[PDB]
Design a protein around this ligand. Structure first.
Ligand SMILES: CC(C)(O)C(=O)Nc1ccc([N+](=O)[O-])c(C(F)(F)F)c1
Length: 242
């Protein structure tokens, strides 16, 4: 199981937010921690992506781009899985030290987005997603959002995406395989709308950060002000199965 051996070997370990849970919840503190957690997670997402089979087949300029565009979606999918495996979807497990109950979902002003992520988390259980299906689907998510004007070398990207779909095919393997593929691709598509709502929220917050006492880390601020608007303005779009 060469491919799956690799995906398991490179899967990131636990990442903490550094949040002060021994203090009353406040919008400012909760979002400052979400931003810090995001910066911390981005570091791991980059190291993970660069270690994926065939990733070096991509043009160097397309490598960071694909990571930046897919970052939110990758985080959402992984968080949903952690929430399912750790707390049976009872709460959103952003990090061991940043678990969201409904009060925090409300305090964070990200309630609608959080409920959708809780639903995604429940889906992992309802569809009985296996750890191996999770790993392969998460990898495919990295190759699911591209620019309309094209990547430096679109062909290398198209080949890589096809190969990851083939690997998902193998993990699944007739009618039974078809039904499963339908379920998984539907689940994958469902991550994009959620990531979009989070992109919009992060963007709006960054623009008003100076007035809400929210602090934005260097790399995150860069992605949110440079890459995210490309997605929100329609220049960069997700690749839906359906
Ligand atoms: C508000 C902002 C940009 O900090 C943010 O969405 N942060 C953030 C941090 C971590 C995680 N995570 O999955 O570990 C997520 C999210 F993907 F759940 F939504 C968002």
């Amino acid at each position: 199981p060469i491919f799956l051996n690799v995906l398991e070997a490179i899967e990131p370990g636990v990442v903490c937010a550094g949040h002060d849970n021994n203090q009353p919840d406040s919008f400012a503190a909760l979002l400052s921690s979400l931003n810090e957690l995001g910066e911390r997670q981005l570091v791991h997402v980059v190291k993970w992506a660069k270690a994926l089979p065939g990733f070096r087949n991509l043009h160097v300029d397309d490598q960071m781009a694909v990571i930046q565009y897919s970052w939110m979606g990758l985080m959402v999918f992984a968080m949903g899985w952690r929430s399912f495996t750790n707390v049976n979807s009872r709460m959103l497990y952003f990090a061991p030290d940043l678990v969201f109950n409904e009060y925090r979902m409300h305090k964070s002003r990200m309630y609608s987005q959080c409920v959708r992520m809780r639903h995604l988390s429940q889906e992992f259980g309802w569809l009985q997603i296996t750890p191996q299906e999770f790993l392969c689907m998460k990898a495919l998510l990295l190759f699911s959002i591209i620019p309309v004007d094209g990547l430096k070398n679109q062909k290398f990207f198209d080949e890589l995406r096809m190969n990851y779909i083939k690997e998902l095919d193998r993990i699944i393997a007739p009618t039974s395989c078809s039904r499963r593929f339908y379920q998984l691709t539907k689940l994958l598509d469902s991550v994009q709308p959620i990531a979009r709502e989070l992109h919009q929220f992060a963007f709006d917050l960054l623009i008003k950060s100076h007035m809400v006492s929210v602090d934005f880390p260097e790399m995150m601020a860069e992605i949110i002000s440079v890459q995210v608007p490309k997605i929100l303005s329609g220049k960069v779009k997700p690749i839906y199965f359906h």
